[PDB]
Amino acid sequence: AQNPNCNIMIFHPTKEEFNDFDKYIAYMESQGAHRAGLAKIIPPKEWKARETYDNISEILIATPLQQVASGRAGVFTQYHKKKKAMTVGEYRHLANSKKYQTPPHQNFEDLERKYWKNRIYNSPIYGADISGSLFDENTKQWNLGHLGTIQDLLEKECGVVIEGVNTPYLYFGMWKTTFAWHTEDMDLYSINYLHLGEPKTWYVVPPEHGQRLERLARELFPGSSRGCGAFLRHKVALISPTVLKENGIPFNRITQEAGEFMVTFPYGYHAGFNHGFNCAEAINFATPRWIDYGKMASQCSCGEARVTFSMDAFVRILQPERYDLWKRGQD
């Protein structure tokens, strides 16, 4: 078996290898990449996402989210307090202000130490889940707005015909902005391109060990667990690498820099944080190997987790028994 220790693999496709997205994902998996839950892909040197990022400042963040933490440094939840709209120009200025800017640090490891030591004592503002794309329309390779849709994958594999669409989202981050432990909706893949700015550090649990993380989460957040059998779907829980190590949870970490892609694989739990002002673009996608994961995916039915329009059809077709109770939570 390839990659039995479930290490995060890093790929360097040539421009020739970068033409066929599906084929390269399949290649990565032939090398065992999916066992880690996360892979890095460094684009060929000839490739560019867009010519320049001039005027990005005009983009509106309609609902910036202030990420307020509760708990202890290594085990906490965050809730999102909605703030007034601001442009990316205003957001960038805020990110770079004395109150919010990245502190002096020696290297990535020093900054990681500072993050887990001090995260809960601050409330950074995240510009998350903004529908849109920053890829040039003339970028033909790995353009996250030009991928085959999940609906077409389901149609090709299963012959089913469903409503729904599948578009990218933009994420504007600053120092300490955080994504909580989660898998994707319906345990889909995700792909994430860091367009510009400071790095993003990722933590990931191998899919074959995801239930170990769930078990620990139920122990660490017992009230949340009683409220919902799938509460990690709420995307509010953080657990530090130190606490994961103390509890024997297998995981890996890696830092993504501007110009790099990350792919998360079905049922690969991940969490992380931003180093400073940056902009990422991400979208969910599917492959034939995903279908079985979609069938098995656990759902939030307490009503907390956000349900996109398109997820309805996935649950309806892949999980018809769950559908009625699940939509009872959506509506």
Ligand X SMILES: Cc1ccc(C(N)=O)cn1
Ligand Y SMILES: O=C(O)CNC(=O)C(=O)O
Binding site for Ni ion (CB under 5 A): 190
Binding to ligand Y by residue 192, rule CB under 6 A? yes
Alpha carbon 56 to its chain centroid, in Å, reads: 22
Partner whose binding site includes residue 302, from Ni ion, ligand Y, Zn ion, none (CB under 5 to 8 Å by kind):
Zn ion
How many other CB atoms are found less than 10 A from the CB of residue 232?
25
Binding to ligand X by residue 185, rule CB under 6 A? no
φ, ψ dihedrals at 232, nearest 5°? -65, -20
Binding to ligand Y by residue 282, rule CB under 6 A? yes
Binding to ligand X by residue 230, rule CB under 6 A? yes
How many positions of this chain bind ligand X (CB under 6 A)? 9
What is the token pair recorded at 264? 């998360």
Q: How far is the CB of 219 from ligand X (least distance, A)?
A: 10
Residue 91 burial (CB < 10 Å; 0-12/13-18/19+)?
Answer: buried
Binding to ligand Y by residue 280, rule CB under 6 A? yes
Q: How far is the CB of 310 from ligand X (least distance, A)?
A: 18
Find the DSSP H helices in the chain. Answer: 21-30, 88-95, 108-118, 150-158, 210-220, 222-227, 241-246, 290-296, 309-318, 320-330
Binding to ligand Y by residue 151, rule CB under 6 A? no
User: Binding string, 282-301, against Zn ion, x = CB under 5 A?
Assistant: ------------------x-
Binding to ligand X by residue 298, rule CB under 6 A? yes
200 among the known binding-site residues?
A: yes
* Span 193-232, contacts to Zn ion by CB under 5 A: 228
- 8 A C-beta contact, residue 181 and residue 217: yes
CA-to-CA distance for 18 and 48, rounded, in angstroms?
12
CA-to-CA distance for 306 and 266, rounded, in angstroms?
19
* Span 299-318, contacts to Zn ion by CB under 5 A: 300, 302, 304
Instruction: Please enumerate, by residue number, every residue annotated as part of a binding site for Fe cation.
Output: 182, 184, 270
Instruction: Please enumerate, by residue number, every residue annotated as part of a binding site.
Output: 126, 182, 184, 192, 200, 228, 234-235, 270, 300, 302
